[PDB]
């Protein structure tokens, strides 16, 4: 009992204090970072880390705070690390978070808030019955918990805690990072990949138990102007040519079934956002999004080949096109340093966790940090309903969260 | 010579005196009429009506003017009316016009404006041609010339002074009416019937020799909003529904072919005219038109019936449906006194005019007097190239013009 009294322990003291300091990230300013609730809980993070015992301790000017937990081995082993981001979502508050501990949680409806009939249900929520046994943290009905990320950071400081109190426990030098303005996607902005320092790294920022994820959407935009001529429409023959039509006959050459809702899994797609304009001009914004490189390039020749059939129809100027790639699928950074994924499964596996892969149908700070050198898969970290108020988290699988940043940092040493 | 010497010198001296005159329309303003020049044209107007010995001359609080030749003949005769508009269009300047008469034309390009370079072409207006030997009046390049419709207006003047002075010419009563803000569309709004007092009426509002016109669309509009529901787009899967594609699904069930830059003469068809929107909504509009009434609606209950089936597939809160009739097709009132356009057809046939049925693609101000009890059919006056610089007429088809309405008067009575 004496290893999970101890983490439970400190798991429920750290992220119970970390989930009362107002962090919420704000686009709207444009200092880095965002709103000074993210500087509070950076210096506060500093303090913790020194304590635990921690090296290289800082907070830049921009407050990303990086430390360092010495190498505990004879070997050479490849620098790791660990992020997690310090913001909380924008869809709600995140002041004055109060959060309430659920100990051997029935599996039935959480009553939030009496006074204001917040309940947290299985019918609106069904995975929560899955959780019977389980110490659960929710908010109180009035803000979001903050479990993203803050159950992720806590994993970070736990673990680091742990194994700094464990020196029986080989491995390499490990560095951690703690990160503004995720939310509102600035984070890899100031990210300093190069005083980082490490071969690869670990996001604790997944979610339900056994997330794994490391392979994302390679994805561009665009925009297309569609260029008609209006006249009375009694008059109109042989004359008008309509450029909302255009964009229709534009959008009847792509593939019907390769849109976003019916797809899933590892299927791409053409994505129509808006369509605006009439007779005589009409705009059209698309996303093109696929996992597999080869076809994500053929999406975009579709376009450009439909583009100049119908230039050499109506002419080089009824049609014009803007198109630029956004971001690329992280697996092909991961791919030469594959093992990354392997050990995480591996360390999964060994803690009787079923990994579940999923791929980002999307980008997100790991799949951008990857490709500026830093190849991250993002772990799991025991947190649901996000960003919003019936967020919660299960201490048990935090539990488990910590158990695989340790595994994970003993199996890189083992195997060097 | 006699005949066509006064016509001529009548024809000139009249028209020159109006066109001088400003009497644009502006929608801006809503006094009624829209500005003062077309009051100052009235009341010029009135005097003349006097001065060639009209009787009952009036001018109504809105601008209107009415007046009455007295019958002359001993049988019952209908009450006819001869009707033409006091403004120029708001396309471009009628101020400060300064008419040019070229006599003996060549059907060659006239130099409108040296200074300006503005040269009226037939390479730009291959009708200029067919004017060789004709007297034309063009602009100066530098306003419009206001033919749309002072042309038909001093037609109209010149037709009842040379009836009063030629008594052995038998007719019934006869009442004009010049009226404002045709242009804009606000000329049948004030537009008093019952103080007209006419079975029927003529417009002096056509264009080249011949053009008769006296059957229009029927006309509705209507506004489909699209309601869809937008989610991240890696996870819509069976939750997205892309409003602009519901748009794009409508106007498919339409038939491709049945639009207007397809369609000419009496063929009907719906015509798109904006679509805006994204993937939480969308909105269409569309006009229908068709000169037959039971086709126009048949096309409002297929797009009554797409609705329909559409709310089956997607739901009744999916397509929402706006949908209104806005105006008729005058044939419909001109049937049950069919008469009054074999009446005009053999005025000009005994003319040597060959004429030329015109379908009003649309609704003019005699389409929508017609419904409003006074059937119109619309005449030519001798104009080409209205609403622009490039404005002129032919002075040689003004008489011929003249010479209509004199034979419509004289076979109404003879027919009586
Ligand atoms: O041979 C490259 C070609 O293979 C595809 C699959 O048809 O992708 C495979 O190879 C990629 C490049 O190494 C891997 O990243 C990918 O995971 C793998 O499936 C095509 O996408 C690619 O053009
Ligand atoms: O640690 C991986 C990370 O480092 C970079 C830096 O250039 O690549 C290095 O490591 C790769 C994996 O072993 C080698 O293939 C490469 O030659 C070496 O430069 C980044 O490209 C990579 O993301
Ligand atoms: O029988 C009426 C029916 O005939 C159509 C032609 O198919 O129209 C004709 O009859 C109308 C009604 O009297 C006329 O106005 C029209 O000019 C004539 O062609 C249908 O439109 C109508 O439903
Ligand atoms: O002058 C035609 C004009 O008068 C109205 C007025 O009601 O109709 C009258 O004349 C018709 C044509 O002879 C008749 O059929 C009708 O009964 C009579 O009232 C208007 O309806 C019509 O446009
Ligand atoms: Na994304
Ligand atoms: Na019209
Ligand atoms: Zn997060
Ligand atoms: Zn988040
Ligand atoms: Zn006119
Ligand atoms: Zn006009």
Known sequence: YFQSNAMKEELIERFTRYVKIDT???EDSHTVP???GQIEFGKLLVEELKEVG?????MDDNGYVMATLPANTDKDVPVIGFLAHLDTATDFTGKNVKPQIHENFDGNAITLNEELNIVLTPEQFPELPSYKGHTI???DGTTLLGADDKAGLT??????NYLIHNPQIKHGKIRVAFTPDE????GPAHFDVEAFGASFAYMMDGGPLGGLEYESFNAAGAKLTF????THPGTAKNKMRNATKLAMEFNGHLPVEEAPEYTEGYEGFYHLLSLNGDVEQSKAYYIIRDFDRKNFEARKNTIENIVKQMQEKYGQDAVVLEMNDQYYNMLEKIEPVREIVDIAYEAMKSLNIEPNIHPIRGGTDGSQLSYMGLPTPNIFTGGENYHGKFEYVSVDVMEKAVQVIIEIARRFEEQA
């Not at 260029?227 to 209006?230: A, E, I, P, S």
């Open 54 to 58: 921690l090296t290289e301790v800082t």
């Open 24 to 26: 919420q990230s704000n």
């Open 137 to 139: 943290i929710t908010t």
């Open 34 to 36: 965002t709103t000074p």
């Open 155 to 160: 994993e970070i400081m736990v673990a680091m």
């Open 227 to 230: 260029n008609g001529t209006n």
């Open 183 to 186: 939310e509102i996607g600035r």
